[model samples]
Target chain A: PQITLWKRPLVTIKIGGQLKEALLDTGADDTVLEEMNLPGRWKPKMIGGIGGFIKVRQYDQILIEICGHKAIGTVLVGPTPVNVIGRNLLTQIGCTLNF
Target chain B: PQITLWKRPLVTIKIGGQLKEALLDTGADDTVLEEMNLPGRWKPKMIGGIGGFIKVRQYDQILIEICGHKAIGTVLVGPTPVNVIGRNLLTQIGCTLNF
Candidate 1:
Protein backbone atom coordinates (compact mmCIF):
# COMPACT_ATOMS: atom_id res chain seq x y z
CA PRO A 1 0.00 0.00 0.00
CA GLN A 2 1.11 3.54 -0.68
CA ILE A 3 0.66 6.37 1.82
CA THR A 4 0.91 10.05 1.03
CA LEU A 5 3.47 12.13 2.87
CA TRP A 6 1.38 14.90 4.32
CA LYS A 7 2.64 17.51 6.74
CA ARG A 8 3.57 14.56 8.90
CA PRO A 9 3.31 10.97 7.70
CA LEU A 10 0.84 9.90 10.37
CA VAL A 11 -0.48 6.34 10.30
CA THR A 12 -2.81 4.10 12.27
CA ILE A 13 -1.08 1.25 14.06
CA LYS A 14 -2.47 -1.54 16.21
CA ILE A 15 -0.23 -2.38 19.14
CA GLY A 16 -1.01 -4.78 21.95
CA GLY A 17 -4.46 -5.32 20.46
CA GLN A 18 -5.21 -1.60 20.60
CA LEU A 19 -5.37 0.87 17.71
CA LYS A 20 -3.58 4.19 17.87
CA GLU A 21 -2.13 6.82 15.56
CA ALA A 22 1.61 7.36 15.46
CA LEU A 23 4.08 9.35 13.40
CA LEU A 24 6.08 7.31 10.89
CA ASP A 25 9.48 8.53 11.95
CA THR A 26 12.12 7.19 9.59
CA GLY A 27 14.68 9.21 11.52
CA ALA A 28 14.01 7.41 14.76
CA ASP A 29 15.85 4.15 15.38
CA ASP A 30 13.20 2.59 17.61
CA THR A 31 9.46 2.75 18.06
CA VAL A 32 8.59 4.92 21.05
CA LEU A 33 5.00 5.08 22.11
CA GLU A 34 3.35 7.27 24.68
CA GLU A 35 3.20 5.49 28.03
CA MET A 36 0.70 2.66 27.85
CA ASN A 37 -0.17 -0.14 30.25
CA LEU A 38 0.99 -3.44 28.80
CA PRO A 39 1.23 -6.79 30.50
CA GLY A 40 4.90 -7.65 30.39
CA ARG A 41 8.25 -7.22 32.05
CA TRP A 42 10.27 -4.28 30.75
CA LYS A 43 13.93 -3.35 30.98
CA PRO A 44 14.94 0.21 31.65
CA LYS A 45 16.51 1.89 28.64
CA MET A 46 17.21 5.35 27.28
CA ILE A 47 16.87 6.92 23.82
CA GLY A 48 18.33 10.13 22.44
CA GLY A 49 16.89 12.65 20.01
CA ILE A 50 17.38 16.21 18.83
CA GLY A 51 16.77 17.38 22.38
CA GLY A 52 18.39 14.78 24.57
CA PHE A 53 17.77 11.35 26.10
CA ILE A 54 14.65 10.04 27.81
CA LYS A 55 14.14 6.94 29.94
CA VAL A 56 11.84 4.25 28.58
CA ARG A 57 10.60 0.73 29.21
CA GLN A 58 11.71 -1.72 26.54
CA TYR A 59 9.25 -4.54 25.88
CA ASP A 60 10.16 -7.23 23.40
CA GLN A 61 8.16 -9.56 21.17
CA ILE A 62 5.17 -7.26 20.86
CA LEU A 63 2.76 -7.51 17.93
CA ILE A 64 2.19 -4.37 15.85
CA GLU A 65 -0.15 -3.96 12.90
CA ILE A 66 0.46 -1.14 10.44
CA CYS A 67 -1.80 -0.64 7.46
CA GLY A 68 -2.92 -4.25 7.67
CA HIS A 69 0.69 -5.52 7.75
CA LYS A 70 1.51 -7.31 11.02
CA ALA A 71 4.90 -7.52 12.68
CA ILE A 72 6.21 -8.72 16.02
CA GLY A 73 9.03 -6.68 17.51
CA THR A 74 10.23 -4.59 20.44
CA VAL A 75 8.17 -1.62 21.57
CA LEU A 76 9.51 1.14 23.76
CA VAL A 77 7.02 2.79 26.11
CA GLY A 78 8.08 6.18 27.36
CA PRO A 79 7.20 9.84 27.89
CA THR A 80 7.33 11.05 24.33
CA PRO A 81 5.71 14.15 22.88
CA VAL A 82 3.96 11.77 20.50
CA ASN A 83 3.78 8.12 19.42
CA VAL A 84 6.47 7.28 16.89
CA ILE A 85 6.67 4.24 14.54
CA GLY A 86 10.34 3.92 13.75
CA ARG A 87 12.48 1.78 11.45
CA ASN A 88 12.22 -1.29 13.69
CA LEU A 89 8.52 -1.82 12.91
CA LEU A 90 8.52 -0.03 9.56
CA THR A 91 10.85 -2.56 7.97
CA GLN A 92 8.64 -5.39 9.18
CA ILE A 93 5.77 -3.89 7.20
CA GLY A 94 8.03 -3.49 4.13
CA CYS A 95 7.96 0.29 4.28
CA THR A 96 10.22 2.17 1.91
CA LEU A 97 10.90 5.78 1.01
CA ASN A 98 9.85 6.00 -2.59
CA PHE A 99 10.33 9.03 -4.80
CA PRO B 1 13.43 5.64 -7.06
CA GLN B 2 12.65 3.26 -4.23
CA ILE B 3 14.83 3.74 -1.20
CA THR B 4 14.99 1.22 1.61
CA LEU B 5 14.34 2.47 5.10
CA TRP B 6 17.48 1.66 7.00
CA LYS B 7 18.07 2.37 10.67
CA ARG B 8 17.94 6.09 9.91
CA PRO B 9 17.11 6.16 6.17
CA LEU B 10 20.12 8.31 5.51
CA VAL B 11 20.54 9.79 2.04
CA THR B 12 22.92 11.94 0.09
CA ILE B 13 21.52 15.33 -0.82
CA LYS B 14 22.85 18.31 -2.77
CA ILE B 15 22.10 21.70 -1.25
CA GLY B 16 23.69 25.00 -2.13
CA GLY B 17 26.04 23.21 -4.47
CA GLN B 18 27.28 21.03 -1.62
CA LEU B 19 26.59 17.34 -1.06
CA LYS B 20 25.93 15.97 2.40
CA GLU B 21 24.22 13.13 4.19
CA ALA B 22 20.88 13.82 5.84
CA LEU B 23 18.23 11.82 7.59
CA LEU B 24 14.89 11.36 5.82
CA ASP B 25 12.72 12.39 8.75
CA THR B 26 9.05 11.85 8.01
CA GLY B 27 8.37 13.23 11.50
CA ALA B 28 9.96 16.56 10.79
CA ASP B 29 7.78 19.34 9.40
CA ASP B 30 10.43 21.10 7.33
CA THR B 31 13.89 20.44 5.91
CA VAL B 32 16.64 21.59 8.26
CA LEU B 33 20.36 21.70 7.53
CA GLU B 34 23.31 22.42 9.74
CA GLU B 35 24.51 26.03 9.65
CA MET B 36 25.99 26.80 6.26
CA ASN B 37 26.68 29.96 4.31
CA LEU B 38 23.96 30.37 1.75
CA PRO B 39 23.38 33.16 -0.72
CA GLY B 40 19.91 34.39 0.07
CA ARG B 41 17.79 36.42 2.42
CA TRP B 42 16.13 34.46 5.22
CA LYS B 43 13.50 35.08 7.85
CA PRO B 44 13.72 33.91 11.42
CA LYS B 45 11.42 31.05 12.39
CA MET B 46 10.96 28.41 15.08
CA ILE B 47 10.07 24.72 14.81
CA GLY B 48 9.14 22.33 17.62
CA GLY B 49 9.77 18.61 17.95
CA ILE B 50 10.06 15.85 20.58
CA GLY B 51 12.59 17.79 22.60
CA GLY B 52 11.51 21.41 22.09
CA PHE B 53 11.83 24.27 19.63
CA ILE B 54 14.82 25.64 17.76
CA LYS B 55 15.43 28.93 15.98
CA VAL B 56 16.17 28.78 12.26
CA ARG B 57 16.80 30.94 9.24
CA GLN B 58 14.32 30.01 6.57
CA TYR B 59 15.78 30.41 3.07
CA ASP B 60 13.59 30.47 0.03
CA GLN B 61 14.28 29.49 -3.59
CA ILE B 62 16.89 26.97 -2.56
CA LEU B 63 17.69 24.02 -4.81
CA ILE B 64 17.77 20.58 -3.25
CA GLU B 65 18.63 17.41 -5.13
CA ILE B 66 17.68 14.16 -3.41
CA CYS B 67 17.67 10.63 -4.78
CA GLY B 68 17.82 11.87 -8.39
CA HIS B 69 14.98 14.30 -7.83
CA LYS B 70 15.42 18.03 -7.69
CA ALA B 71 13.17 20.28 -5.64
CA ILE B 72 13.14 24.02 -5.13
CA GLY B 73 11.71 25.13 -1.81
CA THR B 74 12.36 26.57 1.59
CA VAL B 75 15.27 25.09 3.55
CA LEU B 76 15.93 25.92 7.15
CA VAL B 77 19.46 26.57 8.34
CA GLY B 78 20.14 26.29 12.03
CA PRO B 79 21.88 24.42 14.82
CA THR B 80 20.37 20.96 14.69
CA PRO B 81 21.70 17.72 16.11
CA VAL B 82 21.53 16.34 12.56
CA ASN B 83 20.49 17.41 9.06
CA VAL B 84 16.88 16.45 8.39
CA ILE B 85 15.00 16.15 5.09
CA GLY B 86 11.33 16.52 5.88
CA ARG B 87 7.94 16.30 4.13
CA ASN B 88 8.22 19.65 2.40
CA LEU B 89 10.97 18.49 0.06
CA LEU B 90 9.87 14.87 0.11
CA THR B 91 6.54 15.64 -1.49
CA GLN B 92 8.23 17.71 -4.14
CA ILE B 93 10.35 14.73 -5.03
CA GLY B 94 7.27 12.50 -5.45
CA CYS B 95 8.04 10.68 -2.24
CA THR B 96 5.51 8.38 -0.59
CA LEU B 97 5.40 6.04 2.38
CA ASN B 98 4.99 2.62 0.88
CA PHE B 99 4.62 -0.76 2.52
Candidate 2:
Protein backbone atom coordinates (compact mmCIF):
# COMPACT_ATOMS: atom_id res chain seq x y z
CA PRO A 1 0.00 0.00 0.00
CA GLN A 2 1.19 3.46 -0.93
CA ILE A 3 0.26 6.51 1.11
CA THR A 4 0.60 10.03 -0.19
CA LEU A 5 1.85 12.83 2.02
CA TRP A 6 -0.53 15.50 0.67
CA LYS A 7 -2.25 14.84 4.00
CA ARG A 8 -1.00 13.22 7.19
CA PRO A 9 -0.53 9.50 6.70
CA LEU A 10 -3.21 8.56 9.17
CA VAL A 11 -4.36 4.96 9.43
CA THR A 12 -6.65 2.92 11.66
CA ILE A 13 -4.92 0.30 13.76
CA LYS A 14 -6.12 -2.28 16.26
CA ILE A 15 -4.38 -2.46 19.58
CA GLY A 16 -5.48 -4.00 22.85
CA GLY A 17 -8.71 -4.95 21.15
CA GLN A 18 -9.50 -1.31 20.45
CA LEU A 19 -9.63 0.59 17.21
CA LYS A 20 -7.41 3.65 17.13
CA GLU A 21 -6.11 5.93 14.43
CA ALA A 22 -2.36 6.47 14.25
CA LEU A 23 0.01 8.46 12.08
CA LEU A 24 2.72 6.73 10.11
CA ASP A 25 5.62 8.71 11.45
CA THR A 26 8.87 7.99 9.62
CA GLY A 27 10.83 10.62 11.48
CA ALA A 28 10.13 9.12 14.89
CA ASP A 29 12.18 6.31 16.38
CA ASP A 30 9.61 4.87 18.75
CA THR A 31 5.89 4.56 18.55
CA VAL A 32 4.27 7.03 20.94
CA LEU A 33 0.65 6.56 21.81
CA GLU A 34 -1.69 8.90 23.60
CA GLU A 35 -2.32 8.07 27.23
CA MET A 36 -3.95 4.68 27.24
CA ASN A 37 -4.33 1.77 29.62
CA LEU A 38 -2.46 -1.38 28.65
CA PRO A 39 -2.25 -4.24 31.08
CA GLY A 40 1.34 -5.29 31.63
CA ARG A 41 4.57 -4.30 33.29
CA TRP A 42 6.26 -1.47 31.46
CA LYS A 43 9.50 0.34 32.04
CA PRO A 44 9.42 4.07 32.40
CA LYS A 45 11.41 5.78 29.65
CA MET A 46 11.85 9.23 28.23
CA ILE A 47 11.72 9.87 24.48
CA GLY A 48 12.81 13.01 22.69
CA GLY A 49 11.75 14.60 19.46
CA ILE A 50 11.72 17.87 17.48
CA GLY A 51 10.34 19.89 20.37
CA GLY A 52 11.64 18.13 23.47
CA PHE A 53 11.37 14.98 25.56
CA ILE A 54 8.61 13.38 27.60
CA LYS A 55 8.33 10.49 30.03
CA VAL A 56 6.46 7.45 28.81
CA ARG A 57 5.67 3.87 29.75
CA GLN A 58 7.46 1.55 27.38
CA TYR A 59 5.42 -1.60 26.87
CA ASP A 60 7.37 -4.26 25.04
CA GLN A 61 6.06 -6.98 22.73
CA ILE A 62 2.63 -5.49 22.44
CA LEU A 63 0.78 -7.02 19.52
CA ILE A 64 -0.68 -4.43 17.16
CA GLU A 65 -2.54 -4.94 13.92
CA ILE A 66 -1.67 -2.14 11.56
CA CYS A 67 -4.04 -1.85 8.62
CA GLY A 68 -4.43 -5.65 8.92
CA HIS A 69 -0.74 -6.58 9.07
CA LYS A 70 0.35 -7.95 12.44
CA ALA A 71 3.26 -6.36 14.32
CA ILE A 72 4.70 -6.88 17.78
CA GLY A 73 7.10 -4.48 19.47
CA THR A 74 7.44 -1.62 21.88
CA VAL A 75 4.65 0.92 22.39
CA LEU A 76 5.20 4.06 24.39
CA VAL A 77 2.20 5.63 26.06
CA GLY A 78 2.49 9.20 27.12
CA PRO A 79 1.45 12.77 26.36
CA THR A 80 1.62 13.10 22.60
CA PRO A 81 -0.17 15.42 20.22
CA VAL A 82 -1.04 12.41 18.14
CA ASN A 83 -0.70 8.62 18.18
CA VAL A 84 2.43 7.89 16.14
CA ILE A 85 3.42 4.57 14.59
CA GLY A 86 7.12 5.15 14.35
CA ARG A 87 9.96 3.22 12.77
CA ASN A 88 10.08 0.63 15.52
CA LEU A 89 6.61 -0.63 14.68
CA LEU A 90 6.78 0.34 11.03
CA THR A 91 9.73 -1.98 10.42
CA GLN A 92 7.78 -4.86 11.82
CA ILE A 93 5.01 -4.14 9.34
CA GLY A 94 7.57 -3.79 6.50
CA CYS A 95 6.81 -0.13 5.87
CA THR A 96 9.31 1.80 3.82
CA LEU A 97 9.95 5.26 2.47
CA ASN A 98 9.96 5.27 -1.29
CA PHE A 99 10.60 7.93 -3.88
CA PRO B 1 14.53 4.34 -4.37
CA GLN B 2 13.10 2.53 -1.36
CA ILE B 3 14.47 3.25 2.08
CA THR B 4 14.18 0.66 4.81
CA LEU B 5 13.67 1.36 8.49
CA TRP B 6 16.66 -0.72 9.54
CA LYS B 7 18.38 2.63 9.81
CA ARG B 8 17.29 6.25 9.74
CA PRO B 9 16.56 7.27 6.18
CA LEU B 10 19.16 9.95 6.08
CA VAL B 11 20.16 11.52 2.79
CA THR B 12 22.42 14.24 1.51
CA ILE B 13 20.81 17.38 0.18
CA LYS B 14 22.30 20.37 -1.62
CA ILE B 15 21.17 23.63 -0.05
CA GLY B 16 22.73 27.06 -0.28
CA GLY B 17 25.72 25.49 -2.08
CA GLN B 18 26.41 23.33 0.99
CA LEU B 19 26.09 19.58 1.34
CA LYS B 20 24.02 18.81 4.39
CA GLU B 21 22.57 15.56 5.62
CA ALA B 22 18.90 15.34 6.49
CA LEU B 23 16.41 12.79 7.65
CA LEU B 24 13.59 11.66 5.42
CA ASP B 25 10.99 12.39 8.02
CA THR B 26 7.45 11.46 7.18
CA GLY B 27 6.22 12.36 10.61
CA ALA B 28 7.11 16.00 10.17
CA ASP B 29 4.65 18.23 8.32
CA ASP B 30 7.21 20.87 7.39
CA THR B 31 10.88 20.75 6.51
CA VAL B 32 12.98 22.08 9.41
CA LEU B 33 16.67 22.87 9.29
CA GLU B 34 19.05 23.79 12.04
CA GLU B 35 19.85 27.46 12.46
CA MET B 36 21.15 28.72 9.12
CA ASN B 37 21.05 32.02 7.34
CA LEU B 38 18.84 32.39 4.29
CA PRO B 39 18.50 35.63 2.40
CA GLY B 40 15.15 37.35 2.01
CA ARG B 41 12.28 38.37 4.28
CA TRP B 42 10.56 35.60 6.20
CA LYS B 43 7.55 35.48 8.45
CA PRO B 44 8.09 34.19 11.95
CA LYS B 45 5.94 31.19 12.70
CA MET B 46 5.42 28.56 15.37
CA ILE B 47 5.05 24.84 14.72
CA GLY B 48 3.98 22.17 17.22
CA GLY B 49 4.53 18.45 17.42
CA ILE B 50 4.44 15.51 19.82
CA GLY B 51 6.58 17.37 22.29
CA GLY B 52 5.59 21.02 21.86
CA PHE B 53 6.07 24.05 19.66
CA ILE B 54 9.09 25.96 18.48
CA LYS B 55 9.64 29.29 16.73
CA VAL B 56 11.02 29.17 13.21
CA ARG B 57 11.79 31.55 10.37
CA GLN B 58 9.88 30.41 7.34
CA TYR B 59 11.37 31.24 3.92
CA ASP B 60 9.31 30.35 0.93
CA GLN B 61 10.38 29.52 -2.63
CA ILE B 62 13.75 28.15 -1.59
CA LEU B 63 15.46 25.77 -3.97
CA ILE B 64 16.82 22.49 -2.54
CA GLU B 65 18.10 19.41 -4.25
CA ILE B 66 17.43 16.16 -2.44
CA CYS B 67 19.23 13.14 -3.85
CA GLY B 68 19.37 14.90 -7.19
CA HIS B 69 15.65 15.72 -7.12
CA LYS B 70 14.86 19.41 -7.10
CA ALA B 71 12.31 20.84 -4.63
CA ILE B 72 11.44 24.46 -4.07
CA GLY B 73 9.16 25.49 -1.22
CA THR B 74 9.05 26.65 2.36
CA VAL B 75 12.04 25.63 4.49
CA LEU B 76 12.03 26.46 8.17
CA VAL B 77 15.18 27.30 10.05
CA GLY B 78 15.13 26.74 13.76
CA PRO B 79 16.72 24.80 16.58
CA THR B 80 15.77 21.36 15.39
CA PRO B 81 17.12 18.06 16.70
CA VAL B 82 18.06 17.14 13.13
CA ASN B 83 17.70 18.58 9.65
CA VAL B 84 14.31 17.33 8.51
CA ILE B 85 12.94 16.96 4.99
CA GLY B 86 9.23 17.12 5.61
CA ARG B 87 6.10 16.61 3.52
CA ASN B 88 6.35 20.03 1.93
CA LEU B 89 9.60 19.00 0.29
CA LEU B 90 9.04 15.26 0.20
CA THR B 91 5.87 15.63 -1.83
CA GLN B 92 7.75 17.60 -4.42
CA ILE B 93 10.26 14.77 -4.76
CA GLY B 94 7.44 12.27 -5.11
CA CYS B 95 8.31 10.54 -1.89
CA THR B 96 5.70 8.26 -0.41
CA LEU B 97 5.10 5.87 2.45
CA ASN B 98 4.76 2.33 1.20
CA PHE B 99 4.09 -0.87 3.04
Candidate 3:
Protein backbone atom coordinates (compact mmCIF):
# COMPACT_ATOMS: atom_id res chain seq x y z
CA PRO A 1 0.00 0.00 0.00
CA GLN A 2 1.45 3.33 -1.06
CA ILE A 3 0.78 6.32 1.15
CA THR A 4 -0.10 9.46 -0.71
CA LEU A 5 1.66 12.00 1.47
CA TRP A 6 1.07 14.93 -0.81
CA LYS A 7 -1.67 16.71 -2.80
CA ARG A 8 -2.09 19.75 -5.08
CA PRO A 9 -3.45 23.18 -4.17
CA LEU A 10 -4.62 26.15 -6.18
CA VAL A 11 -1.61 28.39 -6.97
CA THR A 12 -1.76 32.18 -7.23
CA ILE A 13 1.24 34.44 -7.90
CA LYS A 14 1.30 38.08 -6.87
CA ILE A 15 3.01 41.29 -8.00
CA GLY A 16 2.26 44.22 -5.73
CA GLY A 17 -1.54 44.02 -5.78
CA GLN A 18 -1.95 42.00 -8.97
CA LEU A 19 -2.56 38.26 -9.18
CA LYS A 20 -1.99 35.39 -11.64
CA GLU A 21 -3.31 31.85 -11.44
CA ALA A 22 -0.48 29.30 -11.54
CA LEU A 23 0.22 25.54 -11.58
CA LEU A 24 0.33 23.51 -8.37
CA ASP A 25 3.57 21.53 -7.98
CA THR A 26 3.91 19.18 -4.97
CA GLY A 27 7.56 18.14 -5.08
CA ALA A 28 9.40 21.25 -3.97
CA ASP A 29 10.43 22.15 -0.42
CA ASP A 30 10.29 25.97 -0.67
CA THR A 31 8.40 28.68 -2.55
CA VAL A 32 9.98 30.51 -5.52
CA LEU A 33 9.28 33.71 -7.45
CA GLU A 34 11.47 33.32 -10.53
CA GLU A 35 14.04 35.71 -11.91
CA MET A 36 13.96 37.78 -15.15
CA ASN A 37 10.42 39.00 -14.57
CA LEU A 38 11.57 40.73 -11.42
CA PRO A 39 12.65 44.33 -10.98
CA GLY A 40 16.42 44.79 -11.48
CA ARG A 41 16.79 44.95 -7.66
CA TRP A 42 17.69 41.33 -7.14
CA LYS A 43 20.83 40.51 -5.08
CA PRO A 44 22.01 36.91 -5.12
CA LYS A 45 23.15 34.90 -2.07
CA MET A 46 25.41 31.85 -2.03
CA ILE A 47 23.76 29.06 0.00
CA GLY A 48 26.83 27.34 1.43
CA GLY A 49 26.13 23.81 2.59
CA ILE A 50 27.58 20.30 2.50
CA GLY A 51 26.28 20.05 -1.08
CA GLY A 52 28.40 23.01 -2.17
CA PHE A 53 26.82 26.34 -3.13
CA ILE A 54 23.14 26.71 -3.99
CA LYS A 55 22.09 30.09 -5.39
CA VAL A 56 19.22 31.80 -3.55
CA ARG A 57 16.92 34.83 -3.19
CA GLN A 58 15.19 36.33 -0.17
CA TYR A 59 12.14 38.38 0.78
CA ASP A 60 9.48 38.88 3.46
CA GLN A 61 5.77 38.14 3.93
CA ILE A 62 3.29 40.39 2.26
CA LEU A 63 -0.48 40.63 2.24
CA ILE A 64 -1.36 37.92 -0.33
CA GLU A 65 -5.08 38.09 -1.00
CA ILE A 66 -6.27 35.01 -2.95
CA CYS A 67 -9.71 34.13 -4.22
CA GLY A 68 -11.12 36.08 -1.30
CA HIS A 69 -8.91 34.82 1.50
CA LYS A 70 -5.77 36.62 2.56
CA ALA A 71 -2.68 35.72 4.62
CA ILE A 72 1.03 36.45 5.02
CA GLY A 73 3.93 34.06 4.40
CA THR A 74 7.62 34.32 3.42
CA VAL A 75 8.89 33.82 -0.13
CA LEU A 76 12.30 32.98 -1.57
CA VAL A 77 12.87 35.06 -4.68
CA GLY A 78 14.76 33.18 -7.41
CA PRO A 79 16.25 33.66 -10.86
CA THR A 80 13.70 31.40 -12.49
CA PRO A 81 11.48 32.91 -15.18
CA VAL A 82 8.36 32.01 -13.25
CA ASN A 83 6.73 32.08 -9.82
CA VAL A 84 6.78 28.81 -7.86
CA ILE A 85 4.74 28.50 -4.64
CA GLY A 86 6.12 25.87 -2.27
CA ARG A 87 5.38 23.98 1.01
CA ASN A 88 6.06 26.55 3.72
CA LEU A 89 2.82 28.34 3.04
CA LEU A 90 0.73 25.20 2.52
CA THR A 91 1.46 23.82 5.95
CA GLN A 92 0.12 26.96 7.58
CA ILE A 93 -3.32 26.02 6.29
CA GLY A 94 -3.17 22.51 7.73
CA CYS A 95 -2.94 20.53 4.51
CA THR A 96 -1.16 17.46 3.13
CA LEU A 97 -0.14 16.34 -0.38
CA ASN A 98 -0.75 13.05 -2.17
CA PHE A 99 2.07 13.58 -4.62
CA PRO B 1 31.97 49.23 8.41
CA GLN B 2 28.45 47.85 8.17
CA ILE B 3 28.91 45.75 5.04
CA THR B 4 25.51 45.58 3.41
CA LEU B 5 25.90 42.09 1.94
CA TRP B 6 22.37 42.16 0.53
CA LYS B 7 19.90 44.36 -1.33
CA ARG B 8 16.21 44.66 -2.20
CA PRO B 9 14.48 43.91 -5.51
CA LEU B 10 11.12 44.78 -6.94
CA VAL B 11 8.71 41.95 -6.12
CA THR B 12 5.87 40.61 -8.25
CA ILE B 13 3.61 37.73 -7.26
CA LYS B 14 1.41 35.74 -9.65
CA ILE B 15 -2.00 34.29 -8.96
CA GLY B 16 -3.13 32.10 -11.84
CA GLY B 17 -2.72 35.01 -14.26
CA GLN B 18 -2.87 38.10 -12.08
CA LEU B 19 0.17 40.02 -10.79
CA LYS B 20 1.00 42.31 -7.87
CA GLU B 21 4.01 44.43 -6.86
CA ALA B 22 5.38 43.78 -3.37
CA LEU B 23 8.12 44.74 -0.92
CA LEU B 24 11.56 43.07 -0.76
CA ASP B 25 12.70 41.16 2.35
CA THR B 26 16.06 39.43 2.82
CA GLY B 27 15.94 37.40 6.01
CA ALA B 28 14.62 34.02 4.96
CA ASP B 29 15.77 30.79 3.26
CA ASP B 30 12.51 29.73 1.56
CA THR B 31 9.72 31.44 -0.34
CA VAL B 32 6.18 31.41 1.01
CA LEU B 33 2.57 31.90 -0.12
CA GLU B 34 0.11 32.71 2.63
CA GLU B 35 -2.34 29.89 3.41
CA MET B 36 -5.53 31.92 3.88
CA ASN B 37 -5.69 32.80 0.20
CA LEU B 38 -5.00 29.29 -1.11
CA PRO B 39 -7.59 26.93 -2.60
CA GLY B 40 -8.55 24.05 -0.30
CA ARG B 41 -6.46 21.41 -2.09
CA TRP B 42 -3.20 21.85 -0.19
CA LYS B 43 -1.37 18.56 0.49
CA PRO B 44 1.46 19.11 2.98
CA LYS B 45 4.68 17.05 3.45
CA MET B 46 6.53 16.39 6.68
CA ILE B 47 10.12 17.63 6.35
CA GLY B 48 12.33 15.48 8.59
CA GLY B 49 15.95 15.75 9.69
CA ILE B 50 18.11 16.63 12.70
CA GLY B 51 15.69 19.50 13.23
CA GLY B 52 12.80 17.06 13.69
CA PHE B 53 9.53 16.81 11.75
CA ILE B 54 8.89 19.88 9.64
CA LYS B 55 5.79 20.27 7.47
CA VAL B 56 6.41 21.48 3.93
CA ARG B 57 4.69 22.18 0.61
CA GLN B 58 6.19 21.66 -2.85
CA TYR B 59 5.78 23.00 -6.36
CA ASP B 60 7.46 23.80 -9.69
CA GLN B 61 8.23 27.11 -11.42
CA ILE B 62 5.48 29.42 -12.66
CA LEU B 63 6.41 32.24 -14.98
CA ILE B 64 6.69 35.36 -12.76
CA GLU B 65 6.96 38.44 -14.98
CA ILE B 66 8.79 40.83 -12.68
CA CYS B 67 9.95 44.33 -13.69
CA GLY B 68 10.84 42.79 -17.07
CA HIS B 69 12.91 39.67 -16.42
CA LYS B 70 12.14 36.00 -15.76
CA ALA B 71 13.88 32.77 -14.63
CA ILE B 72 13.16 29.37 -13.07
CA GLY B 73 14.00 27.95 -9.63
CA THR B 74 12.83 25.30 -7.16
CA VAL B 75 10.33 26.36 -4.44
CA LEU B 76 9.68 24.76 -1.07
CA VAL B 77 6.12 25.22 0.06
CA GLY B 78 5.13 25.57 3.70
CA PRO B 79 2.11 26.35 5.87
CA THR B 80 1.94 30.00 6.79
CA PRO B 81 -0.47 32.95 6.80
CA VAL B 82 1.82 35.27 4.78
CA ASN B 83 3.83 34.88 1.60
CA VAL B 84 7.56 35.11 2.29
CA ILE B 85 10.27 35.62 -0.38
CA GLY B 86 13.52 34.25 0.95
CA ARG B 87 17.19 33.73 -0.06
CA ASN B 88 16.68 30.67 -2.26
CA LEU B 89 15.22 32.77 -5.05
CA LEU B 90 17.51 35.75 -4.42
CA THR B 91 20.61 33.67 -5.16
CA GLN B 92 19.26 32.53 -8.49
CA ILE B 93 18.99 36.16 -9.55
CA GLY B 94 22.50 37.02 -8.43
CA CYS B 95 21.16 39.12 -5.55
CA THR B 96 21.78 39.24 -1.80
CA LEU B 97 20.66 40.93 1.44
CA ASN B 98 22.37 42.48 4.49
CA PHE B 99 19.69 41.81 7.09
Best by TM-score: 2
Q: Could you tell me the lDDT of residue A10 within candidate 2? A: 92
Which predicted model would earn the best lDDT? 2
TM-score of each: 0.92, 0.98, 0.34
Docking class of 3: incorrect
DockQ of each: 0.72, 0.82, 0.02
- DockQ of structure 3: 0.02
Better of 1 and 2 by TM-score: 2
Best of the candidates, DockQ? 2
Model 2 misplaced stretches (Cα beyond 4 Å) = none
Backbone clashes in candidate 2 total: 0
Q: What TM value does model 1 have?
A: 0.92
Q: Write the per-residue lDDT of candidate 3 for residues A1-99, one digit (tens) a residue.
A: 111212223456555566776333222345555542433344565432111335666555644543344546655554433354444543443333211
- Show the colliding residue pairs in model 1: none
Which scores higher on TM-score, 1 or 3? Answer: 1
| Residue B22 accuracy (lDDT) in model 1 | 90
Query: Global CA lDDT of candidate 1, please?
Result: 0.86
lDDT of 2 by residue, A16-99 (tens): 999999999888888999999998899999988767988899999999999989999999999999999989899999999999
Native contacts present in candidate 3, fraction: 0.00
Arranged by DockQ with the best first, the candidates are: 2, 1, 3
